[PDB]
Design an enzyme around this catalytic site. Structure first.
Site, PDB file in Angstrom:
ATOM      1  N   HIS A  16     147.992  34.643  65.474  1.00  0.00           N
ATOM      2  CA  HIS A  16     148.582  35.574  66.426  1.00  0.00           C
ATOM      3  C   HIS A  16     148.414  35.114  67.865  1.00  0.00           C
ATOM      4  O   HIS A  16     149.214  35.498  68.723  1.00  0.00           O
ATOM      5  CB  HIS A  16     147.974  36.961  66.244  1.00  0.00           C
TER       6      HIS A  16
ATOM      7  N   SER B 119     154.183  32.733  65.813  1.00  0.00           N
ATOM      8  CA  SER B 119     154.660  32.273  64.521  1.00  0.00           C
ATOM      9  C   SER B 119     155.599  31.082  64.700  1.00  0.00           C
ATOM     10  O   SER B 119     155.818  30.592  65.810  1.00  0.00           O
ATOM     11  CB  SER B 119     155.342  33.421  63.777  1.00  0.00           C
TER      12      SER B 119
ATOM     13  N   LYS C 289     161.506  44.386  56.001  1.00  0.00           N
ATOM     14  CA  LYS C 289     161.809  43.122  55.343  1.00  0.00           C
ATOM     15  C   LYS C 289     160.703  42.722  54.375  1.00  0.00           C
ATOM     16  O   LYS C 289     160.977  42.148  53.318  1.00  0.00           O
ATOM     17  CB  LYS C 289     162.033  42.029  56.386  1.00  0.00           C
ATOM     18  N   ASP C 290     159.447  43.017  54.723  1.00  0.00           N
ATOM     19  CA  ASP C 290     158.340  42.744  53.811  1.00  0.00           C
ATOM     20  C   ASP C 290     158.311  43.728  52.652  1.00  0.00           C
ATOM     21  O   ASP C 290     157.906  43.361  51.544  1.00  0.00           O
ATOM     22  CB  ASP C 290     157.013  42.790  54.562  1.00  0.00           C
TER      23      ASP C 290
ATOM     24  N   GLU D 224     144.950  26.440  33.244  1.00  0.00           N
ATOM     25  CA  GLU D 224     146.121  27.269  33.476  1.00  0.00           C
ATOM     26  C   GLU D 224     147.216  26.458  34.169  1.00  0.00           C
ATOM     27  O   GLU D 224     146.996  25.344  34.649  1.00  0.00           O
ATOM     28  CB  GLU D 224     145.750  28.494  34.307  1.00  0.00           C
TER      29      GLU D 224
HETATM   30  C1  HEM Z   1     145.038  34.434  50.020  1.00  0.00           C
HETATM   31  C2  HEM Z   1     145.531  33.399  50.707  1.00  0.00           C
HETATM   32  C3  HEM Z   1     146.328  33.514  52.032  1.00  0.00           C
HETATM   33  C4  HEM Z   1     146.698  34.601  52.732  1.00  0.00           C
HETATM   34  C5  HEM Z   1     146.438  36.094  52.431  1.00  0.00           C
HETATM   35  C6  HEM Z   1     147.429  34.149  53.895  1.00  0.00           C
HETATM   36  C7  HEM Z   1     147.976  34.950  54.865  1.00  0.00           C
HETATM   37  C8  HEM Z   1     148.821  34.511  55.853  1.00  0.00           C
HETATM   38  C9  HEM Z   1     149.789  35.322  56.549  1.00  0.00           C
HETATM   39  C10 HEM Z   1     150.025  36.822  56.296  1.00  0.00           C
HETATM   40  C11 HEM Z   1     150.420  34.551  57.432  1.00  0.00           C
HETATM   41  C12 HEM Z   1     151.538  34.985  58.401  1.00  0.00           C
HETATM   42  C13 HEM Z   1     152.808  35.198  57.588  1.00  0.00           C
HETATM   43  C14 HEM Z   1     153.868  34.246  58.057  1.00  0.00           C
HETATM   44  O1  HEM Z   1     153.769  33.762  59.211  1.00  0.00           O
HETATM   45  O2  HEM Z   1     154.799  33.965  57.263  1.00  0.00           O
HETATM   46  C15 HEM Z   1     149.873  33.218  57.328  1.00  0.00           C
HETATM   47  C16 HEM Z   1     150.260  32.134  58.075  1.00  0.00           C
HETATM   48  C17 HEM Z   1     150.023  30.814  57.768  1.00  0.00           C
HETATM   49  N1  HEM Z   1     149.182  30.398  56.754  1.00  0.00           N
HETATM   50 FE1  HEM Z   1     148.183  31.580  55.389  1.00  0.00          FE
HETATM   51  N2  HEM Z   1     147.486  32.775  53.873  1.00  0.00           N
HETATM   52  C18 HEM Z   1     146.822  32.353  52.744  1.00  0.00           C
HETATM   53  C19 HEM Z   1     146.661  31.043  52.366  1.00  0.00           C
HETATM   54  C20 HEM Z   1     147.153  29.953  53.044  1.00  0.00           C
HETATM   55  C21 HEM Z   1     147.325  28.631  52.498  1.00  0.00           C
HETATM   56  C22 HEM Z   1     146.991  28.205  51.057  1.00  0.00           C
HETATM   57  C23 HEM Z   1     147.824  27.839  53.445  1.00  0.00           C
HETATM   58  C24 HEM Z   1     148.140  26.346  53.222  1.00  0.00           C
HETATM   59  C25 HEM Z   1     148.580  25.554  54.196  1.00  0.00           C
HETATM   60  C26 HEM Z   1     147.989  28.636  54.647  1.00  0.00           C
HETATM   61  C27 HEM Z   1     148.474  28.228  55.868  1.00  0.00           C
HETATM   62  C28 HEM Z   1     149.189  29.019  56.737  1.00  0.00           C
HETATM   63  C29 HEM Z   1     150.072  28.567  57.789  1.00  0.00           C
HETATM   64  C30 HEM Z   1     150.387  27.100  58.141  1.00  0.00           C
HETATM   65  C31 HEM Z   1     150.581  29.631  58.406  1.00  0.00           C
HETATM   66  C32 HEM Z   1     151.565  29.529  59.597  1.00  0.00           C
HETATM   67  C33 HEM Z   1     152.667  30.584  59.577  1.00  0.00           C
HETATM   68  C34 HEM Z   1     153.692  30.265  60.630  1.00  0.00           C
HETATM   69  O3  HEM Z   1     153.791  29.078  61.027  1.00  0.00           O
HETATM   70  O4  HEM Z   1     154.415  31.195  61.067  1.00  0.00           O
HETATM   71  N3  HEM Z   1     147.570  29.921  54.361  1.00  0.00           N
HETATM   72  N4  HEM Z   1     148.897  33.226  56.352  1.00  0.00           N
HETATM   73  C1  HEM Z   2     142.044  36.489  44.352  1.00  0.00           C
HETATM   74  C2  HEM Z   2     141.352  37.239  43.488  1.00  0.00           C
HETATM   75  C3  HEM Z   2     141.307  37.020  41.953  1.00  0.00           C
HETATM   76  C4  HEM Z   2     141.929  36.110  41.183  1.00  0.00           C
HETATM   77  C5  HEM Z   2     142.902  34.986  41.604  1.00  0.00           C
HETATM   78  C6  HEM Z   2     141.537  36.348  39.809  1.00  0.00           C
HETATM   79  C7  HEM Z   2     141.956  35.635  38.709  1.00  0.00           C
HETATM   80  C8  HEM Z   2     141.647  35.919  37.397  1.00  0.00           C
HETATM   81  C9  HEM Z   2     142.178  35.247  36.234  1.00  0.00           C
HETATM   82  C10 HEM Z   2     143.189  34.083  36.239  1.00  0.00           C
HETATM   83  C11 HEM Z   2     141.646  35.797  35.147  1.00  0.00           C
HETATM   84  C12 HEM Z   2     141.963  35.351  33.703  1.00  0.00           C
HETATM   85  C13 HEM Z   2     142.550  36.490  32.880  1.00  0.00           C
HETATM   86  C14 HEM Z   2     143.074  35.924  31.589  1.00  0.00           C
HETATM   87  O1  HEM Z   2     143.422  34.718  31.566  1.00  0.00           O
HETATM   88  O2  HEM Z   2     143.151  36.680  30.589  1.00  0.00           O
HETATM   89  C15 HEM Z   2     140.748  36.853  35.573  1.00  0.00           C
HETATM   90  C16 HEM Z   2     139.992  37.672  34.763  1.00  0.00           C
HETATM   91  C17 HEM Z   2     139.162  38.687  35.180  1.00  0.00           C
HETATM   92  N1  HEM Z   2     138.960  39.081  36.488  1.00  0.00           N
HETATM   93 FE1  HEM Z   2     139.758  38.212  38.129  1.00  0.00          FE
HETATM   94  N2  HEM Z   2     140.666  37.416  39.785  1.00  0.00           N
HETATM   95  C18 HEM Z   2     140.506  37.853  41.082  1.00  0.00           C
HETATM   96  C19 HEM Z   2     139.714  38.902  41.489  1.00  0.00           C
HETATM   97  C20 HEM Z   2     138.939  39.697  40.680  1.00  0.00           C
HETATM   98  C21 HEM Z   2     138.089  40.782  41.123  1.00  0.00           C
HETATM   99  C22 HEM Z   2     137.938  41.198  42.605  1.00  0.00           C
HETATM  100  C23 HEM Z   2     137.492  41.305  40.041  1.00  0.00           C
HETATM  101  C24 HEM Z   2     136.497  42.485  39.927  1.00  0.00           C
HETATM  102  C25 HEM Z   2     136.211  43.325  40.924  1.00  0.00           C
HETATM  103  C26 HEM Z   2     137.960  40.571  38.885  1.00  0.00           C
HETATM  104  C27 HEM Z   2     137.586  40.803  37.583  1.00  0.00           C
HETATM  105  C28 HEM Z   2     138.054  40.126  36.481  1.00  0.00           C
HETATM  106  C29 HEM Z   2     137.685  40.387  35.110  1.00  0.00           C
HETATM  107  C30 HEM Z   2     136.698  41.472  34.635  1.00  0.00           C
HETATM  108  C31 HEM Z   2     138.341  39.528  34.332  1.00  0.00           C
HETATM  109  C32 HEM Z   2     138.248  39.454  32.795  1.00  0.00           C
HETATM  110  C33 HEM Z   2     139.190  40.491  32.200  1.00  0.00           C
HETATM  111  C34 HEM Z   2     140.478  39.806  31.841  1.00  0.00           C
HETATM  112  O3  HEM Z   2     140.485  38.554  31.776  1.00  0.00           O
HETATM  113  O4  HEM Z   2     141.493  40.508  31.615  1.00  0.00           O
HETATM  114  N3  HEM Z   2     138.835  39.595  39.309  1.00  0.00           N
HETATM  115  N4  HEM Z   2     140.775  36.895  36.953  1.00  0.00           N
END
Ligand code: HEM
Ligand code: HEM
Ligand code: HEC
Lengths: 379, 64, 241, 111, 82, 49, 78
Positions: free
Chosen positions: A201, A205, A227-228, A271
């Site tokens: 910010h 952007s 839009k979102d 996966e």
């Molecule tokens: C849970 C994971 C993430 C969240 C919640 C998140 C959230 C955000 C949001 C809401 C924006 C602004 C939205 C927009 O401008 O379109 C942003 C901007 C950005 N994020 Fe992330 N992000 C995540 C992961 C990542 C990853 C994996 C990258 C890899 C490069 C990344 C790089 C960037 C960049 C380069 C911008 C610039 C946006 C622009 O140029 O306007 N972020 N992020």
């Molecule tokens: C970015 C956040 C998270 C990601 C990407 C994620 C991802 C995953 C994935 C890929 C599995 C495998 C399920 C399957 O293959 O059957 C899983 C299982 C599980 N996750 Fe997460 N998880 C997240 C956050 C959380 C949180 C915050 C909790 C608890 C507060 C949680 C609790 C569990 C439990 C209990 C399981 C086993 C139950 C099941 O597999 O259906 N996860 N999660």
């Protein structure tokens, strides 16, 4: 009493970043994945918390508790599958968020981009740790092969492999640790994501044009919130389509048999969002080379901003780089396709070529592409 | 209100004041959710005639 | 390298995106389990109470549960004792431990049938083709004792004797109990035992389609209405002289 | 004398390759000149600040209308595109001086 | 976070016109202009998007065919006449 | 409520915003009833009976 | 023709699976696959020692036949 001077000495001043924030008018749909990523976090935490109210980390009652969630808990079957398919939607949204930065040169926001890689690493750690939670012969064995890769580290490999394992192999000790670790890490991601926005910010952007959009900024509230919201529905539609019509389309069928350390699955594989990295590691017969290439490919994102050569920021007016960008995307799909296939003679040759091209494109061809066009445009 | 088109009477009567705008949303949700379930279930059971437990129950529970 | 035969895609009464399970076939499918599968195969995740409202009534399922004795409840003297089962009881386990199961058979361990539809590639199509796919071994093979040739089984050498044949059981409603017919009912049952949420999965799926089919054009209209200001916006540059 | 280091490029002659690339780049379709799409770093930003008011204001509108075209995912009519021959570098003279100034400043520090 | 409307940039001699959202159609000439537009937009990118993914299908159609063909055996008789 | 003191100006202010506060409680009543299908309340509507 | 009721040694509904299976042994795709199965057996059975056998040709014979029966098997069932 000034309606504009609202309840400012409060938390709303922070919320001015959601209402009165200047945003480029020409923002395309590829930017919607930023807000979608936040919804994916909230959805995963919401379903995760309710899953954690019936899941038990003990090995003797880990798999049986997942069955009890679907079979017994009222409406507990859907929550398990929006969690299993929300991670699929997370990495679908995560990879387009990275891809847009590659195409539109958003990595010039060095602070935001670097925090983005940290955000990427944290999610892949969380997704990998959560896959081991069901404990279903894909959880036990998918974690077995990947975690054993750390044994290739010299002079400290086995020391930290056991320290990860809590023992001599993946067992109940590892399972309890993962569930606790899987609970804490998503709340870390929220904190980092807030920092991720804080570094953006300040510099605004980006736009598909790639030029500064300070001359045509528009308020966020009436134009992008709606839009979102439309973008959110397209995510809910896509996620719910998997959950209600093909819940096990992406997940491997072998995960439904209880984990058995004495028996190996017919084919071992992570996966679908890690299959692109599995192929790179499997490319090199060496063990130490494979783990390094696995980490380097993920960590090559931080090296991208140092490889910029073109005098234009976005790839909109860079046709030579556009041909390479979709070659990289196609190659990334080739790595994903070959990741899920057994290591035989057709996929050994294709696997090496796709992997060697993945690094060659970004490290050599893309920087050379920018130099060629720079000469081609009299500058 | 005084126009020969339906929406003009639909706006001034209800949507003119935001207090009554929310009333039609909450009341509209009451009547929509009740009719939608019956509307979206009757079609579902038509696709599955003679399939579910409702359609084969009649040959059980002795005198019922 | 032991080529695998691809199971055929058998049409099912529940193959469509909105098609549901044939609960008449489920009831006949259970009769295969309680008479053929339960002899040496376990189902430890489905209870006798799960069949209520799916394929049997509450009174019917109580009779089924009480038909089999179960061991539970420490007597006040401190010893185990037998009793007729109840609705809450899970399906009886043929053997106490897997080691006993490997002893009963030729070492092979009968897999649990609770998730066997969703824990195998191909789903019910592979299982149906596996049950009916038994054939005489081709010339040039050498099968060990206690092993039978089934092409749909990986390795083409399965430890399971053919469990289904004509008139192996008798159905309550009287449909012809043939090798193909009996395999279809148990495959329909084995799917329900694997995905009990199958009917509600599509029931909510239809409502989502009828909801997203209406909200998406409506939500799009709000997006266009708010953005119609910028779409219809004329720019004029009038510099001084 | 253009196009590629070779005397003749792949697609015949050398000068036409740059002309072909200009139409391929597509920033003329938006009504932008070549220097209207440059990356704004700490160097280019200063060289913009030295632009004359008549030239700086012209650049603002060219960018302003291009974002309107990009917002609508449209392009200017065939007659309103920036001709490759008529495109002139209005920023190269200003960039070169900031190149000269920065090079002297950077090299003076190391002495 | 920082910055807001008022100090973004210096814009001069630019006049803009806009209409009330209630006095203009939300979907004006949807298929009359959008469809001819999408054909224009797709052509501008099909020469840079399609070829990279067309090659992947060629890899798919050959890498998959080779795998099954390699699985299929070949004659290896050493001495016999049927 | 919706006022600051007890005066004719505030009394007029309260009366002027009674009809909106009058129908605003309907959302709190019907919306809560709609959320949890308040039976005693859902038993009087004819179409939802 | 089987042991259920009536004369002719009774009449147990022969499985429709058997009837459908022989309905597809005359198809062009299935006869040619069966054809390759026959020549394989002569090479293997008459062979004194060799590890080759005839299930791959059988598998191709099954693959063509078993895909046919899926098309027209469930009609006779139930
Ligand atoms: C849970 C994971 C993430 C969240 C919640 C998140 C959230 C955000 C949001 C809401 C924006 C602004 C939205 C927009 O401008 O379109 C942003 C901007 C950005 N994020 Fe992330 N992000 C995540 C992961 C990542 C990853 C994996 C990258 C890899 C490069 C990344 C790089 C960037 C960049 C380069 C911008 C610039 C946006 C622009 O140029 O306007 N972020 N992020
Ligand atoms: C970015 C956040 C998270 C990601 C990407 C994620 C991802 C995953 C994935 C890929 C599995 C495998 C399920 C399957 O293959 O059957 C899983 C299982 C599980 N996750 Fe997460 N998880 C997240 C956050 C959380 C949180 C915050 C909790 C608890 C507060 C949680 C609790 C569990 C439990 C209990 C399981 C086993 C139950 C099941 O597999 O259906 N996860 N999660
Ligand atoms: C004679 C005892 C016995 C009977 C009766 C029996 N099974 Fe099996 N079954 C076995 C054994 C032993 C195995 C494991 C064989 C192996 O793994 O090599 C097995 C394996 C299976 C498998 C797993 C195949 C695979 O590839 O994993 C399925 C599915 C199956 N049986 C279904 C059934 C059905 C349906 C019935 C009832 C018609 C049935 N079985 C009756 C003993 C039996």
């Amino acid at each position: 009493m000034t309606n504009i001077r609202k309840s400012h000495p409060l938390m709303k001043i922070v919320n001015n970043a959601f209402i009165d924030l200047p945003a480029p008018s020409n923002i395309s749909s590829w930017w919607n994945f930023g807000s979608l990523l936040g919804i994916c976090l909230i959805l995963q935490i919401l379903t995760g918390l309710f899953l954690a109210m019936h899941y038990t980390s003990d090995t003797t009652t880990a798999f049986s508790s997942v069955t009890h969630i679907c079979r017994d808990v009222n409406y507990g079957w859907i929550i398990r599958y929006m969690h299993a398919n929300g991670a699929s939607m997370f990495f679908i949204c995560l990879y387009m968020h990275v891809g847009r930065g590659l195409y539109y040169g958003s990595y010039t926001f060095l602070e935001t981009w670097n925090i983005g890689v940290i955000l990427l690493l944290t999610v892949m750690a969380t997704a990998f740790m959560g896959y081991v939670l069901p404990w279903g012969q894909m959880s036990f064995w998918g974690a077995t092969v990947i975690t054993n890769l750390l044994s290739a580290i010299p002079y400290i490999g086995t020391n930290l492999v056991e320290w990860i394992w809590g023992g001599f192999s993946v067992d109940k000790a590892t399972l309890t640790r993962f569930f606790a670790f899987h609970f804490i890490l998503p709340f870390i991601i929220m904190a980092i994501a807030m920092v991720h926005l804080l570094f953006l910010h300040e510099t605004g952007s980006n736009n598909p044009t790639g030029i500064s959009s300070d001359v045509d900024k528009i308020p966020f509230h009436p134009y992008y919130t709606i839009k979102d919201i439309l973008g959110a529905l397209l995510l809910i539609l896509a996620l719910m389509l998997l959950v209600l019509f093909a819940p096990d389309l992406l997940g491997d069928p072998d995960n439904y048999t209880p984990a058995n350390p004495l028996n190996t699955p017919p084919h071992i594989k992570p996966e679908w969002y890690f299959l692109f990295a599995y192929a790179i590691l499997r490319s090199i017969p060496n063990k130490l080379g494979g783990v390094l290439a696995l980490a380097f490919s993920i960590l090559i994102l931080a090296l991208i901003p140092l490889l910029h050569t073109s005098k234009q920021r976005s790839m909109m007016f860079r046709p030579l780089s556009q041909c390479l960008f979709w070659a990289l995307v196609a190659d990334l799909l080739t790595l994903t396709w070959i990741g899920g296939q057994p290591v035989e003679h057709p996929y050994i040759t294709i696997g090496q070529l796709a992997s060697v091209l993945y690094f060659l494109l970004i490290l050599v061809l893309m920087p050379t592409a920018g130099t060629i066009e720079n000469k081609l445009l009299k500058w | 209100m005084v126009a020969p088109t339906l929406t003009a009477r639909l706006y001034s009567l209800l949507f003119r004041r935001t207090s009554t705008f929310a009333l039609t949303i909450v009341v509209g949700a009451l009547f929509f959710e009740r009719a939608f379930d019956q509307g979206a279930d009757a079609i579902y059971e038509h696709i599955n005639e003679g399939k579910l437990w409702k359609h084969i129950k009649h040959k059980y529970e002795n005198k019922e | 390298s032991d080529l695998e035969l691809h199971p055929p895609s058998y049409p099912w009464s529940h193959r469509g995106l909105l098609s549901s399970l044939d609960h008449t076939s489920i009831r006949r499918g259970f009769q295969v389990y309680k008479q053929v599968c339960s002899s040496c195969h376990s189902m430890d995740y489905v209870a006798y109470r799960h069949l209520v409202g799916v394929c049997y009534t509450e009174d019917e399922a109580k009779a089924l549960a009480e038909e089999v004795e179960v061991q539970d409840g420490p007597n006040e003297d401190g010893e185990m004792f037998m009793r007729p089962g109840k609705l809450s009881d899970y399906f009886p386990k043929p053997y106490p431990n897997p080691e006993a199961a490997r002893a009963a058979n030729n070492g092979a361990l009968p897999p649990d049938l609770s998730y066997i539809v969703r824990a195998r590639h191909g789903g019910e199509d592979y299982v149906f083709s596996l049950l009916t796919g038994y054939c005489e071994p081709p010339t040039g093979v050498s099968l060990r004792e206690g092993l039978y040739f089934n092409p749909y089984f990986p390795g083409q050498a399965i430890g399971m004797a053919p469990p289904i044949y004509n008139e192996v059981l008798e159905f309550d409603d009287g449909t012809p109990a043939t090798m193909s017919q009996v395999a279809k009912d148990v495959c329909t049952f084995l799917r329900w035992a694997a995905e009990p949420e199958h009917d509600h999965r599509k029931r909510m799926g239809l409502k989502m389609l009828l909801m997203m089919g209406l909200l998406l054009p409506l939500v799009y209209a709000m997006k266009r209405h708010k953005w119609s200001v910028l779409k219809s916006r004329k720019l004029a540059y009038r510099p001084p002289k | 004398m253009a196009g590629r280091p070779a005397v003749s490029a792949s697609s015949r002659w050398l000068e036409g390759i740059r002309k072909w690339y200009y139409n391929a780049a597509g920033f003329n379709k938006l009504g932008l000149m070549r220097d209207d799409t440059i990356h704004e770093n700490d160097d280019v930003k200063e060289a913009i600040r030295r632009l004359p008011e008549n030239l700086y204001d012209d650049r603002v509108f060219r960018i302003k209308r291009a974002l309107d075209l990009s917002m609508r995912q449209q392009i200017l009519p065939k007659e309103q595109w920036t001709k490759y021959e008529e495109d002139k570098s209005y920023l190269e003279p200003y960039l070169k001086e900031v190149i000269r100034e920065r090079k002297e400043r950077e090299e003076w520090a190391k002495k | 976070m920082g910055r807001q409307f008022g100090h973004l940039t210096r814009v001069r001699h630019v006049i803009t016109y806009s209409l009330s959202p209630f006095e203009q159609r939300a979907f004006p000439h949807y298929f009359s202009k959008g469809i001819p537009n999408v054909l224009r937009r797709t052509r501008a990118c099909i020469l840079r998007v399609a070829p990279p993914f067309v090659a992947f299908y060629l890899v798919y159609t050959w890498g998959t065919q080779e795998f099954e063909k390699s699985k299929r055996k070949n004659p290896a008789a050493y001495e016999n006449d049927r | 409520m919706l006022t600051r003191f007890l005066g004719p100006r505030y009394r007029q202010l309260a009366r002027n915003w009674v009809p909106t506060a009058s129908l605003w409680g309907a959302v709190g009543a019907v919306g809560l009833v709609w959320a949890t299908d308040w039976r005693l309340i859902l038993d009087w509507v004819p179409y939802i009976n | 023709g089987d042991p259920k009721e009536e004369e002719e040694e009774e009449e147990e509904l022969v499985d429709p699976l058997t009837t459908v299976r022989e309905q597809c042994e005359q198809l062009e795709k299935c006869v040619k696959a069966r054809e390759r199965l026959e020549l394989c057996d002569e090479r293997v059975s008459s062979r004194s020692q060799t590890e080759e056998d005839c299930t791959e040709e059988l598998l191709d014979f099954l693959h063509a036949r078993d895909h046919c029966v899926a098309h027209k098997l469930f009609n006779s069932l139930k």
